[model samples]
Target: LEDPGEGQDIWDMLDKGNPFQFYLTRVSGVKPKYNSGALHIKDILSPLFGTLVSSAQFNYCFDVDWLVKQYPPEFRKKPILLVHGDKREAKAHLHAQAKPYENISLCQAKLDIAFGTHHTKMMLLLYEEGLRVVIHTSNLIHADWHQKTQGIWLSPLYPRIADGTHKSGESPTHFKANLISYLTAYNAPSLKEWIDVIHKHDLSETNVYLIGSTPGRFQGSQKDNWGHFRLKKLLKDHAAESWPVVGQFSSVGSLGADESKWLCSEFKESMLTLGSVPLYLIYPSVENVRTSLEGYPAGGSLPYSIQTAEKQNWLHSYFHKWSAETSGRSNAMPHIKTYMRPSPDFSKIAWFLVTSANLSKAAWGALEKNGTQLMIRSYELGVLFLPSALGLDSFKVKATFPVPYDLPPELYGSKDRPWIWNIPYVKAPDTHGNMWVPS
Candidate 1:
């Protein structure tokens, strides 16, 4: 599982002096040689640090019973808080699932903004060793853990401020302050306890920048501090002058009838590179889904609607196939959403981000009121890795950002169209000899 000094195994590179590591999800039922260094659900919960005290889980979906069962037997009875956006009867249904466990508590997020969702996936663990934060791209569900590519960023175990031996204040970043800002937007009582826990910890070892979107309308400085606007600001300051921009995601929101409406115009503008930035969007085609481990059923998690595709026919030009020959997840269908600007040869990376966001205005905010205000419709969380933040010139592709897809990505052929979940596929059968007919 060790990569030679120059190999695309970020996990191995982390131990070799690379401060940041991005872990991809392991694919079950595949050869052990496939995704060898990738992580499984159990790996995240393994007893690598101090004893587990309690944890706060924030996600879009859950299987409370399945989640509790994955924990070590000794840690199962510890407190676990679930923060989600389900409301009304759905909220009750979620509560019922956790009713059998006295240690599980639920908090329904306020979703007053139309079309908004609490789509952030994060975990805060209060350990006897220190407080550790996990920001990832998978929901706490059984299906999400297998036969899909996911992203997870685990922070260092932060010690209590008093116990910190290193001069923790030397690093210059708002990793902790911005975390408080994001949680404060939740305005939930249960999160308050964890927010208090954050205040007492020394998070100066954090090496990434937090990029979050909370439901709101903001102007001026505040407008450029969240959502795509914030992302644009980050790139403007640190990104190279010209580089290919790639956005690989699971879902696509209704952009507009024309390419320039929001995507090629404002949203593209926010990516902040000069001179015709080469944009490649990596999404699976029908062939990719049909050949996956779970076959057509795997497409359920890929929610790009036919209606949305029809309106944005121009998007076809930017599409790329999901081919991960190196990672051996080519047949594992992608649920992870990642964006990055890698060198043309994929030998180095300027920046990388793993987010719970999709290619939609709702996830990345839309500009309104003459671009003075940014309107965001969801609660999203992600972290950005910039070379400068880690005191490096650039992230050597072989040592960091184990890019899942092959470099010089394969563009879609004229006959190859993206897989739209809400449509029927009867021309061919999947590996299980089944076809997808969405209702």
Candidate 2:
């Protein structure tokens, strides 16, 4: 058995200085080497006796205070891991790469895994551990699966979901509304959850990365509205006019008719009116991805499709203007750039994927059942890697490719199955649990 209190005591002693003497007198007994056989015999016995005594001491100390002091309250509570996958391949990938725990369940696998057998046992374990797990999805209705597991499922709250005016018979929209409703209630108690987390981690001083699919499509739900309102207010309140808030929109679902144009104009005008505090934006562009052999041959071949190309271009231009406007300010305007391909430096990003993509009604709370629930469906994951560990430089190259990079047809050639890209490639682990991919 390991000595639980030993590491803590050692650390404390080192902090007080005289660690060498402290270790020698309290942890190890010195023995004479010249006495050969006699000394060797005594040494063996001494170690055994010392270990026994230390074990006792460790148990006693822990029972009295150490154990209580070392454990965090959160540890005692359950944990939830949400799972969503758009297709069979994605589902398999998620399962194989998922973080393993004694108690974990695959929300998508529930039906196939059954309700009360070994699979169910695993699902129960996950629930018992903590009822907060999310998976990937193209639709937000995927969250409904969480109800079966009695776990909390989170989704984006779109404005259209709150309006009740969204067109009927749109399954996607309904799903989005459902997801937004869940997340709104889940995070409602603390409207400033994101801000609080930032402050708690002293991340206010750090560059804040806000990545998502769309920026200007506000459906109008209270939760979604509050988030935008609070974010702007928080930025101004902190007087962090210099901090950069970078964003990237996903290439899925149109941002509603004329909504994109309105958003671009409003956003640009708002930034200019606010003294141009630097709001960097990027959209998929032909020029950005044209070099790749697999790049879209024509504008219509991309995820947003050719019809929305004008809107995407407009948004991209708006960002360039915003970036230029902040050229001489105390807080440099956010450098706006677009990506034609997924970035290779995702490991260095501090935060990625921050919004509920349910466009308009689906993202907000009016309860529309017309948008793609999967589009509004969201599962956000983030990590805070040490800068030295990841070699990420926030000051340099914030956005890489603004447009989708073309790959050979073998890679992403089919219009029916356009390739989806994400930052930070996750590498597989070996038997020893060491990552095989370089960060």
Candidate 3:
């Protein structure tokens, strides 16, 4: 019989239809009182072979150890930089650490370093192979920038507009402008290009996710502001052929009568003519997206809504189910598995900080000296890992229902909820045809 690590090769051995075992060791930087056991990979070792070891038996046995031993003493003693950014000075310090490189350069470098030119390249290799790059804030006027930087993805989770009113009654317009800037600089494709890519990728098979909280009164109202109309149009025109768009509108008054009318009309038409495309809506209080979906006809599309009360109910049910499945007890319920649970293996994720950069001309460029104008900014961070890194037994959770958790429940739950949907929707008229309107 051939040696397990011989002529047939490690890949062949791993690919063989048999069970096997391997060991993984992780050295902890901080000393521990007790020993932490090593990780073990069992059976179907095919997956681990390429990732954890090389094809050559000698290299797999001694190459890594030899390389580590060759490193200089000083190289092992280098200190890791840990930067915090809750306060202004802290934020400035973080920015300084990132100062040597421009924003776009840093962003591109990070992407290339993360994903590599192809899938076969390992992340550690990319990180070690440094490349100079340039970065910049996305500009809406520049379409070329977007086209050239197609594969570089930007997080769409942050709000472009702040929660406030503008001198002109155009919070929605302001919001739209900001959205346009984001798209133009990042995801917004020329109408035709958007359609082509969506078709080519078959993105419809994978769900598209969108989340928004009521920012200002006018924003929540969902009137026929430019931003509102633009978003509706984009959904109607380009969202993949069969991919469902799941939108979580955090609070009530998020969709105004006009906005609702447009959405319902387009949604109904899309269902009747094109295949049924599901739209999931979520609310903070007793309000549910079902009410909004109820506005549409049957056999057209599926509309789902959930209120804060319902969210709590679902969480309770989930906790009970988990306890019953695991320990057969219900009294000592575990924390609702929303922000961190359901799947322990997948802990690394991208956390984003968002603010207002609304989509209107007034907010984008024409703010008065005395009028209230919105300025939104954010610091977002995300973690990327290969599917194999997550482990064989663990997988990502896919649930249509809301995760059980509360953040200032009152504000997110009801009309009386403070700051929930409390941005002033209307403001007094300004001197020059400009009236203050809540975002």
Candidate 4:
């Protein structure tokens, strides 16, 4: 959203942008006491949800009071519903707050998102007359909405359709179906009733892909190995050909970070072809950190335990390129993890995926157990956009695209490259001083 028009420092741009609330005054770990954080948040949400609405939040952590105090009047006075993991400590944290503002209900829900716990962070709202859903990568804490750089994908408003005279497909499409699927994963009655309410409205026009992974240890044949594997299976059948792949993420699983054997066995096998596109890993450099908008806390960063030099060794060798400036945006700090495969022709598009599933075996759910069930460790979800399906095929994706990601990913070139995945790595640091390490 930083359109670059004024002569403001990185800090000023980020603060004034209201990406989150915490500037400096409200929280520690920042210099110059950046504490001008009041109107920006309310100003945005006030119009989004004016007043009186049923809100449901799916977050790993919950701060019921944060929304009541900092959010607008509608959110504060309305009946608020939220979901948190079923842990004594987790429930205790949500119970500590007592603002006496609105009637807030806490949902102790569990799902098949598995080992990582119910980590899907989303906000589904039944507004006065419209159903608006916001899905992104952020927790329901002050730090997430206030200080961190997160991604938000909003769906168009869905108004209620008339009764008796019409059918489901006659109005909106599968938006409701996909949402119901996500809710069904929870298998909770509280959410079930909401689903019934959701079904009443026509949500077919929604233009977002629902990519979710339900964690489970299967016995023999189950359509599992979600996340990347799920995506690959779809592409393997439909894609015209293979294209180069690029990735940028905040958290890369230890197994996921292994360039030699990352993703999973099934996923790696899926990319076997002759003329496979190149793979590149795009991450914030130390130089960007050394010079940032008030030097964003490294704590918000996703780090690697391996020494920088060792990591750099491989990066510099195969595919090493540093600084987003290399891609166009001179100083845009990325908090969103993205994976895309574009045609070798550059003009032709392929497939693009923006997701909350970090680079890890856990987030993606790859199965490898002793002799029983399919082993899964985390709950992750995201959406994938294909050019063929989205009406943006080949050169069709060029007009709206921009540098670094001017292409939306599509099949291209002679063929595929099997077994060996030459996943690219970032070059080296320029602005940031070192790899992300929590201080």
Task: Give a tens-digit lDDT track for model 3, residues 213-319.
Answer: 11122322232222222233323332223333222221122122343332344322322221144332222221211112121111011112233223333222111
Quote the positional error of residue 226 for candidate 3 in Å: 15
Candidate 4 weakest ten by summed lDDT: 416-425
> Which lDDT tens digits does candidate 4 get at residues 142-182?
65544334555555556766666565732222446666876
Of 2 and 4, the candidate ranking higher by lDDT: 4
* Candidate 1 C-alpha lDDT tens digits along 182-293: 9998899988999888988888888888999889888999997788988888777755556788899998999888878898898878775521778889999988899899
Of candidate 2, the 10-residue stretch with the lowest lDDT total is 53-62
Question: Which rank order by lDDT, best down to worst?
Answer: 1, 4, 2, 3
For each candidate, the alpha-carbon lDDT, in order, equals: 0.84, 0.24, 0.21, 0.51
The TM-score that candidate 2 achieves is 0.30
State which candidate, 2 or 3, has the greater TM-score.
2
What lDDT is reached at residue 203 by model 2?
15
* lDDT (Cα) of model 1: 0.84
TM-score-better candidate, 1 vs 4:
1
Off by over 4 Å in 4: 1-44, 48-52, 98-102, 111-115, 145-149, 169-173, 218-225, 236-242, 256-260, 268-276, 294-296, 306-332, 345-348, 369-374, 395-399, 402-439
Best by TM-score: 1
Candidate 1's C-alpha runs over 4 A off are 1-17, 163-171, 273-275
> If scored against the real structure, what TM-score would every candidate get?
0.93, 0.30, 0.22, 0.70
Order of models, best TM-score first = 1, 4, 2, 3
